[PDB]
Amino acid sequence: AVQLQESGGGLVQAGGSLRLSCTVSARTSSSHDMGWFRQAPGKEREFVAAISWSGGTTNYVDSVKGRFDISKDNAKNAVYLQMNSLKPEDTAVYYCAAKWRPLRYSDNPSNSDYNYWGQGTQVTVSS
């Protein structure tokens, strides 16, 4: 199993920024995709962004392209979501997640059917 724990979060004025971090169990192998998902109360969970833990290829949900940036630091077992240009629509509980992936040619990370989940962190965007 891979364990994950979010840090960062809180309240930010619209237009502002916030970074989320996700700490990853230290002996996690390279054969994974890391991702961020979010869920607002009343709504279904939705994919936000993902990064291949081995190759660094990224993918984003359309509504955050150009605003959020996902990155990783394998040496520190960390994943990050830099949230810029925050909009009221972005208010949600954000979850770190990981998915085991076999070796392959295409490095493009998955956006669904993740295996391992953090406990979530609330991000609230005001005005």
Residue numbers in the entry: 1 to 52, 52A, 53 to 82, 82A, 82B, 82C, 83 to 100, 100A, ...
Question: How did the manuscript describe this experimental structure?
Answer:
Three heavy chain only camelid specific antibody domains D7, A12 and C8, termed VHH, have been isolated after immunization with gp120. D7 folds into a typical immunoglobulin domain closely resembling known llama VHH structures.
The extensive inter CDR stabilization suggests a potentially lower flexibility of the CDRs upon binding to gp120. However, the tip of the D7 CDR3 (Arg100 - Ser100B) is highly mobile evidenced by the lack of continuous main chain density for three residues, including Tyr100A positioned at the apex of CDR3, indicating that their conformational flexibility might be important for gp120 recognition. Instead D7 Trp52A is involved in CDR1 stabilization as observed in another VHH structure. CDR3 of D7 is tilted 40° towards CDR2 compared to the orientation of the CDR H2/H3 of the other antibodies, whereas the apex of CDR3 is also built by an aromatic residue (Tyr100A) like in b12 (Trp100), F105 (Phe100A and Tyr100B), b13 (Tyr100C) and m18 (Phe99). The decrease in affinity is mainly due to an increase of the dissociation rate of the D7 mutants, which suggests a change of interaction between the CDR3 loop and gp120 but no major change of loop conformation. Together, these data implicate that VHH D7 interacts via CDR3 with gp120 and identify Lys95, Trp96 and Leu99 as key residues for this interaction.
